[PDB]
Design a protein around this ligand. Structure first.
Ligand SMILES: Cc1cn([C@H]2C[C@H](OP(=O)(O)O)[C@@H](COP(=O)(O)O)O2)c(=O)[nH]c1=O
Ligand SMILES: [Ca+2]
Length: 129
């Protein structure tokens, strides 16, 4: 896979963010994550964690996987990096997202994320407390 440039337009919630990609505004949904909705437990914390990660970054990048690049709602489906750190992985490692929505072709980082989930669960972090 390859990392491509983007810039932050606005944080939205734990697993969606609005970025400018190839000069166009797009909402991205983070591959392989399911954060709780803002109105659910750990929802606000997940939104806050992603917001801090993308707002503080000097450089955002998006990385598409091998499969579909947009979902049925027109959201971009990618791995998002903030100063080289993958937000998709970080949310899982901190117990603020579950690994979810693992569809064939878009699962390059599946094993990396499941290893993070196992550690978050062992630590009884957040969702796993
Ligand atoms: C993460 C992701 C979600 N989706 C679709 C499936 C779900 O459809 P439904 O809306 O019919 O439940 C929805 C979940 O996203 P959210 O967790 O943002 O609600 O987005 C994909 O199709 N591909 C994906 O990789
Ligand atoms: Ca969600």
């Amino acid at each position: 896979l390859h990392k491509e440039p983007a810039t932050l337009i606005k944080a939205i919630d734990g697993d969606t963010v609005k970025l400018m990609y190839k000069g166009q505004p797009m909402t991205f949904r983070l591959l392989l994550d399911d954060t709780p909705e803002f109105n659910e437990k750990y929802g606000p914390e997940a939104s806050a964690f992603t917001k801090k990660m993308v707002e503080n970054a000097k450089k955002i990048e998006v990385e598409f996987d091998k499969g579909q690049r947009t979902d049925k709602y027109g959201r971009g489906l990618a791995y998002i990096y903030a100063d080289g750190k993958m937000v998709n992985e970080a949310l899982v490692r901190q117990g603020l997202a579950k690994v979810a929505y693992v569809y064939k072709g878009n699962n390059t980082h599946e094993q990396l994320l499941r290893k993070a989930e196992a550690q978050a669960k062992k630590e009884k972090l957040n969702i796993w407390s």
